[PDB]
Amino acid sequence: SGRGKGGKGLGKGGA
Amino acid sequence: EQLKHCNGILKELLSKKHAAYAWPFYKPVDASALGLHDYHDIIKHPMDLSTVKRKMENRDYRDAQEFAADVRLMFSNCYKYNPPDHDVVAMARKLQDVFEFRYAKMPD
Amino acid sequence: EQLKHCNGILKELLSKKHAAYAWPFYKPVDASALGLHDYHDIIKHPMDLSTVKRKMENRDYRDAQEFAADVRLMFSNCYKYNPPDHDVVAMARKLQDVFEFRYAKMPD
């Protein structure tokens, strides 16, 4: 479709 | 003989320690199951750790830079395909710190 | 063309936005001023962003791949010369993530 795998804003960390 | 090190690099990458952020890279990216309609259009040359381990076994790498080129293309691919704020991106950098470090402290 | 995109990546590495962890890579390492009498014995091929730049303005890179080997050489020397815990190693990996990302986002 678009752009990723569905993990936009998922997880912990990254500033 | 440098490939005795890349073997140890590959084992380190594939170890349980890193399993929390290494799992997206264990097997080739499954475009059909995840619905990535555009993936093989954006990524001409897919790569993953299983595939690295197979090429390592068929001894398809002559020296360390060839191995490292596949390991990096693996990361480059996630970076190209995925927006900067996706989880898979961050997992990729965590795994890549492990690779770039252990790859730099290679004897030679 | 890609070389055009390489230019953009350069200016992106040099920009104020990344200055906090980019500053140690701006010009060749000053072994004398930093007091590293052994830096040159260990690092045979010094590299820095000022050198990548000059190579860019002169068209000395045939393609994006050569550009990228020099940028990675820069980080490599850093990972190789410094202890794994040194703040400079962390600054490099932080600069490298930025590079690699913009570099993956190049059309190809």
* Cβ partners under 8 Å of residue C16, min gap 6: none
Rounded Cα gap, residues A2 and B75, in angstroms: 20
Any idea what the Cα angle at residue C73 is, between residues C44 and B5, rounded to 5°? 85
Is residue B25 within 8 A of residue B53, CB to CB? The reply is no
Closest alpha carbon to B71 in B92, B42, B41, B85: B92
Q: Which of B23, B74, B21, B71 is nearest to B45 (CA)?
A: B74
The tally of CA atoms less than 13 A away on the side-chain side of residue C83 is 3
Report the alpha-carbon distance of residue C10 to residue C49 in Å, rounded: 8
Please name the residue that has the structure tokens 């890549």.
Answer: B96
Rounded CA separation B97/B103 (Å): 10
Query: Under a CB-based contact definition with an 8 Å cutoff, are residues C59 and C31 in contact?
Result: no
Alpha carbon distance B46, B81 (integer Å)? 11
Residues 6+ apart with CB under 8 A from C76: B104
For residue B83, give Cα distances in angstroms to B91, B93, C101: 13, 13, 10
Query: Who contacts C87 (Cβ-Cβ below 8 Å, separation ≥6)?
Result: none
Question: Which DSSP category does C41 fall into?
Answer: H
Contact indicator for B56, B6 with CB cutoff of 8 Å:
yes
* Least CB–CB distance from A8: residue in B34, B35, B85: B85
Q: How far apart are CA B107 and CA B2, in angstroms?
A: 8
Residue B75 forms contact with C (CB below 8 Å)? yes
Domains of chain B listed by start with CATH number = 1-108 (1.20.920.10)
Other C-beta atoms lying within 10 Å of the C-beta of residue C70: 18
Chain A residues whose CB is inside 8 A of the B82 CB are 3-5
**C-alpha distances in angstroms, B5 versus B9, C14, C46, C75, C89?**
6, 34, 24, 20, 21
3 state SS of B25? helix
The CA-atom distances, in angstroms, between C46 and each of B84, C26, C27, C72 are: 31, 12, 10, 11
Instruction: Identify the chains in contact with A, defined as 3+ C-beta pairs within 8 A.
Output: B
Q: What resolution in angstroms does the PDB record give?
A: 2.3
